[PDB]
């Protein structure tokens, strides 16, 4: 991403990250999504409506919508993993919840189902959601470092 491109030469970051969700569906696919922010991690089952930050968007009026995750960490600056270090860690899981709470990130953002997907017929409906990502207004980077000393534009041979 351009967000990951512009933050690789640095060692600290802070600020807000903007996530743009984009549901591809017909006009007759209805339901509610739900966007949990959890600073640490989500438990293995259902997540309660209290004890987390959530939004519960209806996808009838807003099929496309962005959500800005502000800075709610115990520090002022988190560390930067780099593009070199992000290739070995799990940052998008879609089968379980990812592990946040590290000194490298600002928590985790998860999507749950509140109301089921309603269908206009007996056909199998394959609805997808796209995650686009950008920097928010708070976003800053500092400490120029060694984050791109191992990167290259030539393949591995």
Partner 1 sequence: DNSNNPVGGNPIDNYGTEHAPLLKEDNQYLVYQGERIVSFKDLLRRYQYLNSYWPQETGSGFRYYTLDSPGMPIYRGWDPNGIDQGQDSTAGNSPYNFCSMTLLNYLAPAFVCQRGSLRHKWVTAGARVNSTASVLSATRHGVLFPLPLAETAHPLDNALVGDRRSELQEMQRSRLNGTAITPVRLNNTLEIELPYYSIGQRFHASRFLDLAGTGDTQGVEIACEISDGGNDANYRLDQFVSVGEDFTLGMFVGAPIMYFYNDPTAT
Partner 2 sequence: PSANDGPSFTTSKTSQNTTSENVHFVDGDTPWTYDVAATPDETSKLSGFDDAGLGEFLSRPIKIQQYQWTPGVQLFQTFNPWSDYFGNADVLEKINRFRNLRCKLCLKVLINGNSFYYGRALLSYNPYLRNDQVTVNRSFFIQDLIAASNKPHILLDPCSSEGGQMCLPFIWPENYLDITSTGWEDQMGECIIHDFDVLRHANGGTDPITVSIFAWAEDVSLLIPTTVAAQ
**At closest approach, how far in Å is the CB of 122 from partner 1?**
28
The region of 40-48, 58-66, 91-99, 110-118 touching partner 1 under the rule CB under 8 A is 58-66
Instruction: Say which entry of partner 1, partner 2, none residue 48 contacts (CB below 5 to 8 A, set by partner kind).
Output: partner 2
Per CB under 8 A, 55 contacts partner 2: yes
Query: Does residue 114 touch partner 1 according to CB under 8 A?
Result: no
Within a 10 A sphere around the Cβ of 110, how many other Cβ atoms? 20
Q: Does 18 bind partner 2 (CB under 8 A)?
A: no
Q: Using the rule CB under 8 A, is 142 a contact of partner 1?
A: yes
Count the residues in the chain: 157
Task: Identify the residue whose tokens are 């502000």.
Answer: 70
> Using CA atoms in the order 71, 72, 76, 82, what is the torsion angle rounded to 10 degrees?
-60
Contact status: 112 vs partner 1 (CB under 8 A): no
Contacts (Cβ under 8 Å, ≥6 apart) of 3: 17, 133, 134, 135
Q: Which does 38 bind (CB under 5 to 8 A by kind): partner 2, partner 1, none?
A: partner 2
Identified binder of partner 2 from the candidate list 57, 80, 81, 109, rule CB under 8 A? 57
DSSP 126: -
Instruction: Bin 101: left if φ > 0, else alpha if -120 < ψ < 50, else beta.
Output: left
């Amino acid at each position: 991403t351009a967000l990951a491109f512009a933050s690789a030469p640095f060692e600290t970051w802070q600020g807000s990250i903007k996530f743009h969700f984009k549901v591809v569906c017909s006009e007759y696919h209805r339901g509610r999504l739900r966007l949990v922010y959890n600073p640490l991690t989500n438990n293995a089952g259902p997540v309660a409506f209290n004890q987390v930050y959530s939004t519960t968007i209806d996808i009838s009026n807003d099929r496309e919508f962005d959500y800005e995750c502000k800075w709610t960490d115990i520090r002022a600056w988190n560390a930067c993993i780099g593009i070199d270090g992000a290739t070995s860690a799990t940052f998008f899981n879609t089968a379980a919840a990812v592990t946040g709470g590290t000194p490298f990130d600002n928590g985790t953002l998860s999507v749950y189902v509140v109301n089921e997907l309603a269908t206009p017929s007996t056909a199998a409906a394959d609805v997808k959601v796209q995650v686009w990502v950008s920097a928010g207004d708070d976003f800053a980077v500092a400490v120029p470092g060694v984050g791109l000393s191992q990167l290259s534009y030539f393949q591995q041979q």
